[PDB]
Amino acid sequence: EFDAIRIGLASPEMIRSWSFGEVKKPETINYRTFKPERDGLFCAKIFGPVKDYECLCGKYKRLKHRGVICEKCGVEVALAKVRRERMGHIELASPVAHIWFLKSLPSRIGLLLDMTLRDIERVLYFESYVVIDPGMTTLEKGQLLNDEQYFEALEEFGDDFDARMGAEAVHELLNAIDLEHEIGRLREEIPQTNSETKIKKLSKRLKLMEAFQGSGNKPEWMVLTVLPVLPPDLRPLVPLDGGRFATSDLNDLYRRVINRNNRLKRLLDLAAPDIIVRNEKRMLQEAVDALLDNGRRGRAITGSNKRPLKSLADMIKGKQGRFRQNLLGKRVDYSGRSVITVGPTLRLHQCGLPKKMALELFKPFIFGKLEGRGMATTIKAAKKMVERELPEVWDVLAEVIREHPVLLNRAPTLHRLGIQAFEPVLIEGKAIQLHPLVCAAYNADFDGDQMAVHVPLTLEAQLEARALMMSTNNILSPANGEPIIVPSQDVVMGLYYMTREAINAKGEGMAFADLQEVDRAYRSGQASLHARVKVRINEKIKGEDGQLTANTRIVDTTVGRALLFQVVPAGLPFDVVNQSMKKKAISKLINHCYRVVGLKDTVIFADQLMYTGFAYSTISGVSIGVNDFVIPDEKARIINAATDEVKEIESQYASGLVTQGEKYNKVIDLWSKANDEVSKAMMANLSKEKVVDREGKEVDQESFNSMYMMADSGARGSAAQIRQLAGMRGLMAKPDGSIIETPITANFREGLNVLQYFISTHGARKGLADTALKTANSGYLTRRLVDVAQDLVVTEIDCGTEHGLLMSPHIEGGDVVEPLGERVLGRVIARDVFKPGSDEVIVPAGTLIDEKWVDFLEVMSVDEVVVRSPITCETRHGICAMCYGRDLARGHRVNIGEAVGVIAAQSIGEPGTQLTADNVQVKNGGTIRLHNLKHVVRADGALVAVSRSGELAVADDFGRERERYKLPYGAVISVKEGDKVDPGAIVAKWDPHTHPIVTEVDGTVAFVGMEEGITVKRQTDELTGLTNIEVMDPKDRPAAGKDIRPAVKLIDAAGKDLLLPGTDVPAQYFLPANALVNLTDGAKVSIGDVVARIPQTGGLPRVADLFEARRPKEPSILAEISGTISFGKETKGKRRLVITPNDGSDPYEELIPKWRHLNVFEGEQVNRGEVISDGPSNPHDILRLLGVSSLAKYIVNEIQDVYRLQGVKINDKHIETILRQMLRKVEVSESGDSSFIKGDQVELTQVLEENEQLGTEDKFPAKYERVLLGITKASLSTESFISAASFQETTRVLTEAAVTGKRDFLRGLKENVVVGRLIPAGTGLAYHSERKRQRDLG
Amino acid sequence: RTTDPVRMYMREMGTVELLTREGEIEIAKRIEEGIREVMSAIAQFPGTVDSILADYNRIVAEGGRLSDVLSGYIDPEEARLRFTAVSEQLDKAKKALKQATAELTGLAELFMPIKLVPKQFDALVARVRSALEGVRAQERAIMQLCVRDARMPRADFLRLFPNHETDEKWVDSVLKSKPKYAEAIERLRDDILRNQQKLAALESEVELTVAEIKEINRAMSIGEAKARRAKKEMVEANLRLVISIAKKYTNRGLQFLDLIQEGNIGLMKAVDKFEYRRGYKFSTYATWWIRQAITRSIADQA
Amino acid sequence: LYTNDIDCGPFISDTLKIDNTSNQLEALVEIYRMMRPGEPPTKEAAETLFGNLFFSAERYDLSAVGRMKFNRRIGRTEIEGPGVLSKEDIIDVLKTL
RNA sequence: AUACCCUCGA
């Protein structure tokens, strides 16, 4: 065994140790005799023998001496496999710099010499000298000299100045670094300079120097004086048929390097002139650079082809970018594929398998069984029987297939559900038969899809297939507890048609003694499928745990509902099946049955539902005909009216009265209203388009029109599509996004004109083009999500912490978006839950909330609860099994070893393909309550609230808040806390239209410095619209009026100076430009009076932005520290708003440029959490100021809005898991034990602080600040280098690991995947634990 | 910050300019002057002259060919007369080994116009540099011995010892200087003296002293440096020709720089085998060698 | 300097206030430095390179469609024109821009 | 039995 794969620089001595010879000849194989030549790229002396256990001459052919090397044949006789491990070396006449440590964005060789990459490139390209060992001379070691400059320096000095050129000079510089002295000097000079940029550069210098010192790495090794050569089979020449040979790019590059090296030696040995020698050295540097990588500087090309050569960097990068196609993809055996086909006679656990595919896949199993039964003696006979397809081979094939599950997956597997185990059944054909109910999970229709089939071999593999990924096990979606193996289109249609009702039908009225009599009457044809009848039933209810009570009851229902209830298992009431059985109702029924009865009865119920749905959709000859699309009669009248209106509006525009810009909006609004009215009329006609006779007088009933059934049942189609099918198509958008001024009046039944078809083509082309980019972005996003959240696996059971996130129902707006029940279902409680009256414990502790608990919480008036979240659970290297709540694919709590991180990433990324103001008006009646409001009462009781943080809530009678609204600054509210307000009332009468400035104090104000023409302007509007004064702009004012700002000095009614609480200075708010101060100076202004009034995306890109924690073009400016805010000096061009908190004055405040509008009013509480200027928030400021839980709530809500817009439901556990993975790193402020500023894992800092507490001193513990990293940045910054190297930027991370000397302990999922070990999660957890037991404990 | 290597090759080479054919004649005259100087230096080494007499004896005994020994002057019968004269000069110089110095100067004058095949040139160079290597090795041996054992100071080392290396005068003088280091030297008298006996044997083989051999080898080195400088000037002149001719074979399955470097090697070979008395332009002869080099390079890569 | 503020801005005049290029040789050598960086430029070499890139029947050509469309877009009655860019063609494109 | 290019399906 082994562990902890290391990475470091290759020493010339260790490079020699690796090699088995010195490659010296460029050519590979002689054209006359086809054996590799001496000292060539395939020489037998170096790389090994061509034929296993053979030599060059054949002197020794026996298989006995496997290590002896013959006398005439120096090529040691050994196995042919050895050509894969044996490498050689090339001795270069001069050293050449390594391309990776040169051209990486932070140049390691440049950083180690404190000289810019440009200067090093000048030296390497033989353009300028560099100075080595300055000695006692004016020249410095870092000084570069030109030809004339160097000649002058040599003439002036003569000696004591070693100046060189090329990579030889760089090598001479590197080995004279004296890393100890440089580290000491740079550490001494690190705190001397207070510049942030310089301190950052010297900190990076320190990091590199300490990495080199600790890692046992030598700086001179960066410039390789000797380079290896790949073993011949890893750079093979695959002979083309016809005697041609196909040479790999590696062979071409190696040949080029060898040729240039041989040229170098034989031109230095004859003392060629300096210019040509330096040109040859440059060529050798370029050739080695092209061998190592390409396109960085030179972009070398091949012969007679514009395609660049493939270097080793591109080889290790793999295909598909950096996603290793050989170490992660790894085409497998015992596999096949074919087109899929629906099999309606299949049970949920089994799938059809063609005879030939099954016979080919299970061939070794068939051979084994044939030999065991003795029917075949030699394997040749077994092959003859299996190829003859003798009748007895089908019996043994059936025996090997009986209990051997197989794996089926679609091409894009967006989640674990995309590959499930099926117990194959032999079928006659070439297509793979699929169960209809698993198509939804696979997202696989039968329009040409193909599926790959894989045969697990080991008993471990078969048991994992049967116990974890058998199709019956995964009924519920891992993304949300809602079922995924649910009736789809056709079976939903059948079940819906069965459970309908007709006003008058054959067989209506009589009573049936049992469901059996109902079936007997229906099959005999004496009763309609949907006829209102009476039937008594024997339902067994599971109301009490462990006690199944059966009761007999007579229910008024239909024949179809009674028939379908005969399928329902024995734990559910009949009332669950007495409705119309729409798709959502059926899905909820399956979900309820799973959580009540079990799993086996649930799969039986699902199979029975599918069978009956198919049977009764076949019995009902439902069909689509031209008469089914019922065009409403009023559509013609509505269209004519709208055409008359648009003609009138066009005439008005021609008159010039109406502007084109307003006419566009008017006509689009008119046409949208007409389209909505037409659609409403069509739906109202279609839905009730049934007139029936009930023993005389005619009556109406729900329609039996086929298209209406297909919509209402939810089987297939939507109202938006019937809007096109039977109503006007409505407005359509031009490619620029502007809605075309004329709509499509015709529907698909009437047929569109040519122009309308062309517009619909605009729309359809836009959508179809968007689809492919949506798929690509979703794939990239889910790949990044998986690679950032893979190491997270449940390890502990209960971490022990009591921190979590306060979860409350999402009530953004007037309606409840998500009830509290759905948010905390399957979660775990973090603290006590209390009644409306305290001291009464409802939910004690971390009890996993289930259906019973959510019903209990709904019965009580619990509104806000705190639950344990993965962002909590401070356990190290994993997550506790509580803080990650109930598993979603299973009904119970998660089990140790569940890779919830990968499940989270798959859950978030799977539905990506589905992606792309004055006053408050209370909705319903409820007791109004205030939250986070800080305002004093007005003179008359207006209660104007100037605080920016504040909201208005209308709590229900029970106590839960039914609706909440954001109350803005300066809002007058008729405070009636505890007094119920009727629905539609306007309790708060805010009307900002401006930035009002409240006046918390009263008295006769003293507007000091109000200059009419310099600071203010008594400009009155027309018709005496305002008796006020307009403040003069700072630049529009005079030279002296530019610096003068109006100030309303705080005085009382008699002239007494007043000041705001907390600060001695008065609340004399300045009046800036564009102000509205109506109150006369010296007039008593009431408390809260308005003094100064100043007038003021979505889809996959948005969720990607949130998961990368990006900064938009204009981020929202937020307050830094809570306290007394000030005014920003606009003269300097950037507003500086100093903050003076009452608890402690901190004068530090940044300057915000006035390029973006700032809506901040001075003289109020800063409220660090609050916002200073509008705009989309920058995830960071929220994290570093509001906290972690606040950032968690904001990010979760932001992602969930995007997902809920398309109606896809995803549990928040997954988003919180990804958030935990991103917040995994923290930066340190005052270390005492580490570097000043460093990005270290929070686990590392926590461990260091815990050890320091019980250690040398007590102050050794470090203080740190949490930092947020994007997924593409958090994934590349992992401690393991193998995980990052196979994600992205392989070169950068590999060079960083090389210089840093990183070690990778294979303790993640991808590490064990690439190295071929058992996964540290799932069933490999036991193996990993035993390995840890045997390793750590001796 | 151009990254194109061809571009910087053009920049660095573009400083030098061409020259008319009289300039080529002058450069070839410089080459001839250097080789004449080094050959005249070789004349002051009796072993080399005896070796050229032996090669002539092989010529007469048909052990060597006319084209494998001589390369003209500034038919074998003129060679007969010239080597008879040089042998008579050698014998008259050896007879009176004062006036012997004048006799060797006349010997160098007579052997000065002669020109020989490069193989014999490298043989003569190998002999003289081997004598130099022996002297230098004795220097290093004595130096490491005394410095690392007796701690005898480097100042008196580089003051009194040099240029004799053969007589007991320096050992005795250091012994009479009476430091403790001279007392420690007495343990190392035997090895140093027997190595100096070998040096004296080498000198008696060559009949010359250390200072004389140093003078001749220094003059030969100066002549070689002059010839090397002339060749450098000439090849830097013809770099333009080599790039111009290298244009023909770009897409021949080989890089441009490899082609021009092989053509450069060919043109240095051409310079090594170019004479001005042919009365021809250089380009005519350089084209053949450059074509040979480039074509062979491309043929090797098939 | 006949100009205005709201319309007719100094877009060219402001551009001409830079690059410190007075002689046509200075402009030619600057263009040679830009297009062929590194190699030291000579008068003849830079002039030849600029001429070849600008108005040579080889290494540059507008087809009949190209000339017709350029004339139509910049504004010209003649449909047919020279195959190479005219001296005043660049001035016309600058004016249109 | 290696790399590009083209076309096609989900």
Ligand SMILES: [Mg+2]
């Ligand atoms: Mg499909």
